[PDB]
Amino acid sequence: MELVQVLRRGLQQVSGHGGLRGYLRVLFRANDVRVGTLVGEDKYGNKYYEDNKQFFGRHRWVIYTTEMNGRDTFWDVDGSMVPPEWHRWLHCMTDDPPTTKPPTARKYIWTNHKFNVSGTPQQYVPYSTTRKKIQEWVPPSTPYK
Amino acid sequence: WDNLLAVIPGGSSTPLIPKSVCETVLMDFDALVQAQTGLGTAAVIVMDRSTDIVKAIARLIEFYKHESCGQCTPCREGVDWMNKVMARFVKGDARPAEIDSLWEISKQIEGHTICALGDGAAWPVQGLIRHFRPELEERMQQFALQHQ
Amino acid sequence: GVRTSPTGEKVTHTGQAYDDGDYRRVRFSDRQKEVNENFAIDLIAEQPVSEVGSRVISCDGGGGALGHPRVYINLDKETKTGTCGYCGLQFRQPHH
Amino acid sequence: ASATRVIQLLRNWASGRDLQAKLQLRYQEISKRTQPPPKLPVGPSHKLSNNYYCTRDGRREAMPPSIVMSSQEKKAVTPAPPIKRWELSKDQPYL
Numbered sequence: 001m002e003l004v005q006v007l008r009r010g011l012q013q014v015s016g017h018g019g020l021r022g023y024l025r026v027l028f029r030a031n032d033v034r035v036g037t038l039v040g041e042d043k044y045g046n047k048y049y050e051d052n053k054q055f056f057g058r059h060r061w062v063i064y065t066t067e068m069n070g071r072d073t074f075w076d077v078d079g080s081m082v083p084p085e086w087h088r089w090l091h092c093m094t095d096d097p098p099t100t101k102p103p104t105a106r107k108y109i110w111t112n113h114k115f116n117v118s119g120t121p122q123q124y125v126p127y128s129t130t131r132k133k134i135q136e137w138v139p140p141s142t143p144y145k
Numbered sequence: 146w147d148n149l150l151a152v153i154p155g156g157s158s159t160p161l162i163p164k165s166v167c168e169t170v171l172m173d174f175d176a177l178v179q180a181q182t183g184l185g186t187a188a189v190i191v192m193d194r195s196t197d198i199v200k201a202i203a204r205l206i207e208f209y210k211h212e213s214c215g216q217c218t219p220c221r222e223g224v225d226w227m228n229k230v231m232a233r234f235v236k237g238d239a240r241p242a243e244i245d246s247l248w249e250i251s252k253q254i255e256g257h258t259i260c261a262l263g264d265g266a267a268w269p270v271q272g273l274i275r276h277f278r279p280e281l282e283e284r285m286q287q288f289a290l291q292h293q
Numbered sequence: 294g295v296r297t298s299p300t301g302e303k304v305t306h307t308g309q310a311y312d313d314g315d316y317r318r319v320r321f322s323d324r325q326k327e328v329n330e331n332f333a334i335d336l337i338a339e340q341p342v343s344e345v346g347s348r349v350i351s352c353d354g355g356g357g358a359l360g361h362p363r364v365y366i367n368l369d370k371e372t373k374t375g376t377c378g379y380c381g382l383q384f385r386q387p388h389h
Numbered sequence: 390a391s392a393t394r395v396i397q398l399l400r401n402w403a404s405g406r407d408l409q410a411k412l413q414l415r416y417q418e419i420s421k422r423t424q425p426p427p428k429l430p431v432g433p434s435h436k437l438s439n440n441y442y443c444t445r446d447g448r449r450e451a452m453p454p455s456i457v458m459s460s461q462e463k464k465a466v467t468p469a470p471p472i473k474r475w476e477l478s479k480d481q482p483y484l
């Protein structure tokens with residue numbers, strides 16, 4: 001009996017992911033075919049699912065967006081593509097998703113979560129943030145002598 | 146005499162004394178010294194049962210705060226602190242622990258000032274606590290129940 | 294506000310910008326000079342000055358434990374506004 | 390990230406114990422990751438009176454080491470009374 005139901009829900013796996021094409025899309029992209037309730041979505045396109053039935057660690061997950069900040073992320077993705085508001089919910093540091101509890105807004109907070117900028121020409125180059133200490137004599141211009 | 150609540154024997158410096166003691170007290174220096182007070186300047190200040198003893202002692206502490214010359218630390222800072230504490234006490238804005246805190250502050254003021262004004266400001270607080278702690282406790286309880 | 298030096302380098306809030314005849318600028322080509330656009334020097338300026346109706350006022354920075362240590366500012370000089378030394382918020386007596 | 394009954398019997402028999410009762414995967418028994426705010430208590434010295442640091446001082450009541458002999462019948466003594474032999478564990482003496 002459970003064999004038949006087990007064979008069956010493997011078809012709900014392909015039905016949930018928008019048919020066969022989406023099934024191979026998620027299989028080749030996120031390496032999983034499991035379905036889950038759409039907890040939310042961010043402005044960059046990442047979709048955020050949760051399934052409390054899964055054991056602690058895989059109860060929440062992301063399908064990363066195809067495109068972010070002028071970069072194709074269909075095939076290459078990383079953990080820095082998580083916006084700061086949702087990084088709390090994803091890492092099980094809270095049970096309140098940004099959809100229900102949104103983080104407090106302030107002027108200085110960014111509006112475009114840049115990913116790891118290492119490698120790309122938008123890297124970070126250390127430099128001294130202080131001015132000079134010893135000044136020079138700046139000799140006069142009149143020949144005089 | 147039944148309507149007498151308290152007697153200040155010799156001015157603000159001398160601690161007050163309750164009616165039970167006032168029944169039989171000679172007015173010499175030694176007799177009042179045995180009565181945990183002083184003859185001072187023989188300034189009899191009688192307060193009847195219709196007197197807010199907390200209010201009167203707080204007014205005395207306010208006088209001492211206004212008259213402190215501010216030279217030494219215990220009188221400059223301590224007396225003002227006692228004034229604030231007694232101002233809260235009059236409205237009962239405190240808890241039972243600050244009564245002992247005020248006693249400790251008064252003891253810290255005593256014997257640590259250049260002149261005797263620090264002791265003359267600490268003594269009224271000590272007398273008021275020693276003879277009317279239940280009054281402060283009950284006023285504080287009334288304020289607590291009202292602020293509910 | 295962040296502005297551009299004659300060479301082209303953006304000056305930070307600390308007034309830092311490499312000189313034209315400075316080789317160190319080599320590090321920034323094919324990269325960018327990481328600077329913070331939100332200047333604290335400006336951002337604190339437009340914060341309204343609170344009309345406190347008392348001689349002195351206590352500032353904790355807002356949020357209690359979330360803010361700075363609570364300090365008391367004396368608002369007695371009518372020619373200036375008392376400014377907290379921790380967060381920069383100003384206060385002023387109601388026209389004295 | 391649930392096994393069928395047929396599989397559970399195979400796992401249980403191959404191991405000889407009820408694995409479903411005690412699993413190494415945490416499903417829902419864990420504490421909720423969001424918790425109510427706590428109110429921490431105070432120590433034994435959060436008193437408003439009789440709290441002078443002279444009594445509570447720990448560092449200032451450490452005297453210098455006490456010398457018992459310097460270079461500038463009497464029964465033999467021991468650093469301490471001898472250890473007492475340990476006893477077998479009544480819970481599980483022999484493993």
Ligand code: SF4
Binds near residue numbers: 221260263
């Ligand atoms: S105790 Fe006497 S000397 Fe000290 S501040 Fe008060 S008035 Fe001045």
Ligand SMILES: [Zn+2]
Binds near residue numbers: 378
């Ligand atoms: Zn401040």
